[PDB]
Amino acid sequence: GRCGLSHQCCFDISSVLSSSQKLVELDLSDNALGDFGIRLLCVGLKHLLCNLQKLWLVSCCLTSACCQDLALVLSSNHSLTRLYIGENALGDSGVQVLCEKMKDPQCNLQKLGLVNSGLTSICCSALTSVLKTNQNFTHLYLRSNALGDTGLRLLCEGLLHPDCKLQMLELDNCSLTSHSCWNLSTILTHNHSLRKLNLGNNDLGDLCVVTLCEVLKQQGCLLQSLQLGEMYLNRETKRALEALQEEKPELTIVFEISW
Amino acid sequence: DYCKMYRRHVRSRFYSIKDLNSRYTQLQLVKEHPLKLELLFEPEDGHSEPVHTVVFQGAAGIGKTILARKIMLDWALGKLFKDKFDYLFFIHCREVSLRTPRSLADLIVSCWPDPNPPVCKILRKPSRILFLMDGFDELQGAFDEHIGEVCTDWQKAVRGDILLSSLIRKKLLPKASLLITTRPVALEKLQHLLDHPRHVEILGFSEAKRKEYFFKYFSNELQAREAFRLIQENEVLFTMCFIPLVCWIVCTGLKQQMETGKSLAQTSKTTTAVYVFFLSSLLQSRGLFSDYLQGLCSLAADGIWNQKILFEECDLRKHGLQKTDVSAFLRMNVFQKEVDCERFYSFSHMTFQEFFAAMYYLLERDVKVLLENYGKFEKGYLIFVVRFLFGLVNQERTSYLEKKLSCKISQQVRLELLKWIEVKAKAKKLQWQPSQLELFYCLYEMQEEDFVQSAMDHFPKIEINLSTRMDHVVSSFCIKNCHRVKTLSLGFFHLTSSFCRGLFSSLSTNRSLTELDLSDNTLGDPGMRVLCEALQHPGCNIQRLWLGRCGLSHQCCFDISSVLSSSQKLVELDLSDNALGDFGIRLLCVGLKHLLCNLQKLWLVSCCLTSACCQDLALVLSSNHSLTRLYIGENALGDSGVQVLCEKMKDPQCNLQKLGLVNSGLTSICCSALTSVLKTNQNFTHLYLRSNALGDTGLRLLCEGLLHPDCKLQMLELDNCSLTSHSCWNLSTILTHNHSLRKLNLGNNDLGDLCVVTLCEVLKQQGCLLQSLQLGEMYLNRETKRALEALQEEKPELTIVFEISW
């Protein structure tokens, strides 16, 4: 991670990923594995039978032009189930590939960190497809992404598929109308989809957290936690939020903004 | 060259309008953003570097076009006007409202063409052209004022659509200043449209210069004083005397009454009431006219219904009831045709037009589409329409009008309004939709007890912001008729003694149930004095009083002490961000202890006090037992109160659950006092040390305080410190020895990788804490993250660690 590294390692590590029967995770972080070395990586992964568990391509300066190969190796292998691609240089136009990674069950990809993407609508539509179809898809770490209200709306529409087991989820950056959060809370009430959630730099307004605290107040939607940061909202929101946890510890915590 | 002949044309246009030169009193221009028309357009680099435009606002119906005309004529005459500009063009959009694609339109009377190309040539170097466009509210069409699809040429000689040429000229490459006049109903179309503008509010008649206007309008002796003072003696009509349209309509409406005599202040309650009285006074000797009024009525409203505000010299009227009655109407309404100056007929300020629209539904369509279309931009905001509708639907006025006009009126509309009220009760988008203030206007204007009660039942909480005394009165009226309203938040935007006294004598009638907030509002010297006399009477009063960030000072202290003595309903009282410096904390504490009060919370957060009052806080805390939640949040105290801090809770049965703390000074002694309280005091659930210069020895002796078993201390926090990564180990081990707390936070604590490594090991083996733990802002290496992300899924006992960034 962050090591002085380049494309050359790719074939090498592919070779050892083939010949290794002991490695269970391998991290490639902040290292200039630009592209086509991701191809060498994926061919090394799929060609033999390897007991790989994690695979981190975080901040590796790749593009969508290798995501198809990532999907191929993900379909072929089943040992790999934890695939961070964290906020590298991809986004839209990989969206069809993003979906067809998990277009069927038995993919076995528990967590899937995501990227600073581009056009929200199509990628979040692929996310809805994976959420409604794929089993054991425990996390979806969309973070610092230009995702819109329509995007997250169709995301909760993806949550509308019941029996979809999706644990901890996150929507970091967005600008929504304060009914969308109401839809997600109500859909959690309808079915205990996830456990916690984060809202980061989301400009949501007082009424947003007001609806949030009411819906959690009456048989709370989520059951574990919720994290809110960096708002300058008025303080009767704080009074309502500080009230509700002591009567109901179901919402174990809301991350207090500053006070 | 061209300037002179048209500056005389505009002088001729605006001199004759009434005169109005010696008939004017200055109104108020205000820009708070928390005036002087001279040099209104400073582009100075304080906060207005690139700006080019201002929007005029104010109370409903100022005659605003009149003020535009006054500015126009003032420049035309000069009057010490340093000419920053070569032309100010008055656009009467009430006429430009047509759909016709028109080019630059500097001709109005269709005179010989202006030097339009050389006018375009005197553009590039001097930006001394300006267009005072007015009546933006009357841009008709299909309520389509979104972003322009197609731009226009800079020469402006192209006869493009004003939607596609003029609007984009405003939007991009304007090259000239801009001033637009309209009401705040539904303008955001043009403001989400990027302009980088300012806004200024216009305020009508204050008492003194309203008297000046009365003197200037009336003759100096015939009616200048006695009428003024007799309408002064009215408890109302001084609420509306602020509004200029009311003053202009009572000044013109009372010169017909000396022929009758002593009929001035009668039947004068509300805007609808005075409009009805004025219309009846004008139409007194007319009854014949029963059909003429209906014919004019059944056509006036279509000006905004079909959205053809212009009558085309009243050719639609030529179809509908054109007789000598039209000549009589024009003669008594001189400002109908003369404003157009060539052929055309219209109304004065469309307010009598909306009154006639209310008359329409009074006489005999469907109410469904109107209430659906409420406040839109197709039938014309419907604001004054529904205002007069509510004013009329009052049952006494219903009977009076059904007898006067020989007309049947439906009572279903009353229910429709009801339905509407529940709908706007359930409308969560109240920021970009009509507020609660005009609903209050309407319910006041319709004066029905049970109806106002039912309307208020749908609203458990009120959010308004007072600007007019009319706002104060309508708020008082509605609030004194509430039973299903819990919280009453009020926005004061400035005497106020009696206003708020009424506002909360309404709460004295709200004894059914109430809750109060007054935050981020500057209660003056008697602003403190309000709500004290209100809380000083028994009954059912506010359970929880809020005064946070309010303009407040030492004076309130004694006052609130008094009400804290005389109140048996308050359970919490907040004093936040308010300059209750010191010795007012003494007044607070003496008020608390002297009597028996059921106080629960007490927030002195960010009140600029010192340790010199903490002893008094401890005395009152020892005396009282009801108080158990005492925030002193990070105000200006610290060490040297430490002995007091301890001796607050030196014994049990103190009953102080939570105790927020302060940015303190010398750690050791204060945290020693904290150890004393932790080891001795029962039911001490929180200890919110935050943003404090607390040292490793400090927190070490704190965990030594935790060493006392059977000490019930819930959620705890240590925000800022620099510790060795064994101290955290001690706290975790002592939690393992005894389940002291539930969660903890570590904030800006620079702790090192080994710290969280020890943390995750000790929680890994039968975790110390049992609920949560919060960590923020570390740049630590990532195998710490792997260990922490691992442990929760195998053991959810530590339900969460706040992830730093990933």
GROMACS .gro file of C-alpha atoms in nm, chain B residues 227 230-231 234-237 250 253-254 256-257 260-270 273-278 280-281 284 397 400:
model
   34
  486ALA     CA    1  -6.063   6.248   1.143
  489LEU     CA    2  -6.093   5.967   1.570
  490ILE     CA    3  -5.939   5.686   1.367
  493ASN     CA    4  -5.982   5.295   1.697
  494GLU     CA    5  -5.801   4.990   1.834
  495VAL     CA    6  -5.764   4.888   1.468
  496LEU     CA    7  -5.708   5.079   1.139
  509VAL     CA    8  -5.923   5.587   0.367
  512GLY     CA    9  -6.279   5.713   0.104
  513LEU     CA   10  -6.358   5.979   0.363
  515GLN     CA   11  -6.745   6.178   0.063
  516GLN     CA   12  -6.851   6.158   0.430
  519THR     CA   13  -7.319   6.276   0.542
  520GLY     CA   14  -7.135   6.349   0.867
  521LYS     CA   15  -7.010   6.135   1.156
  522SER     CA   16  -6.979   5.810   0.960
  523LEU     CA   17  -6.601   5.767   0.962
  524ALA     CA   18  -6.486   5.499   1.208
  525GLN     CA   19  -6.791   5.272   1.175
  526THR     CA   20  -6.774   4.915   1.039
  527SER     CA   21  -6.395   4.937   1.002
  528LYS     CA   22  -6.232   4.611   1.113
  529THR     CA   23  -6.019   4.441   0.844
  532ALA     CA   24  -6.421   4.523   0.578
  533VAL     CA   25  -6.275   4.857   0.472
  534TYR     CA   26  -6.283   4.759   0.104
  535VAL     CA   27  -6.651   4.663   0.133
  536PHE     CA   28  -6.729   4.987   0.318
  537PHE     CA   29  -6.549   5.196   0.057
  539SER     CA   30  -7.063   5.064  -0.061
  540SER     CA   31  -6.985   5.433  -0.004
  543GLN     CA   32  -7.448   5.425  -0.225
  656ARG     CA   33  -7.099   3.969   0.606
  659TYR     CA   34  -7.537   4.142   0.474
   0.00000   0.00000   0.00000
